[PDB]
Amino acid sequence: EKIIVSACLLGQPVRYDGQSKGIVSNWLDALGAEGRALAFCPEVAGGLPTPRPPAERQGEHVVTESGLDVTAEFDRGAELALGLCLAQGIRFALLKEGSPSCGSGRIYNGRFEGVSMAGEGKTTALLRRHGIQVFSEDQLPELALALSLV
Ligand code: SF4
Ligand SMILES: [Cl-]
Numbered sequence: 001e002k003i004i005v006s007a008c009l010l011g012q013p014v015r016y017d018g019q020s021k022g023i024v025s026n027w028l029d030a031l032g033a034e035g036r037a038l039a040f041c042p043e044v045a046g047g048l049p050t051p052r053p054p055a056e057r058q059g060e061h062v063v064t065e066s067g068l069d070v071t072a073e074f075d076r077g078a079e080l081a082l083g084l085c086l087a088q089g090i091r092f093a094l095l096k097e098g099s100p101s102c103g104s105g106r107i108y109n110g111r112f113e114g115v116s117m118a119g120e121g122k123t124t125a126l127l128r129r130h131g132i133q134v135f136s137e138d139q140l141p142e143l144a145l146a147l148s149l150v
């Protein structure tokens with residue numbers, strides 16, 4: 001049984017600033033070693049480059065600070081994450097917290113002022129809407145338990 005994981009959490013240099021968000025986790029390393037952790041970046045899958053400007057949700061829209069509307073790429077990325085889960089039989093996702101794509105408990109408030117609020121990214125919202133459970137990197141014990149139970 002496999003999971004989909006934000007590519008940056010696996011150390012891939014796909015974040016908007018070219019860096020990674022690699023986490024230290026013996027459990028996640030073991031899952032990857034078994035071919036069970038499928039790396040996926042919704043923004044790169046959706047056609048955005050690396051690096052790319054910071055973006056925030058404004059309701060259903062996703063925009064950069066200059067007003068460029070990148071919702072099309074964000075939605076494509078979300079739909080491709082769902083497509084990957086349906087094709088592979090995946091029911092769990094481990095996604096990066098705070099992201100306008102991968103956030104699950106919090107996101108930036110759309111005002112470009114470093115202020116977070118309760119909410120979720122576009123990919124997380126679509127996956128949850130289709131019965132896929134999404135956990136952040138702050139919820140590894142719950143994800144590991146959910147995965148082992150089935
Ligand atoms: S879109 Fe998600 S997986 Fe891709 S770099 Fe941003 S937080 Fe990581
Ligand atoms: Cl950052």
Ligand SMILES: [Cl-]
Nearest residue numbers: 096097098099
């Ligand atoms: Cl963050």
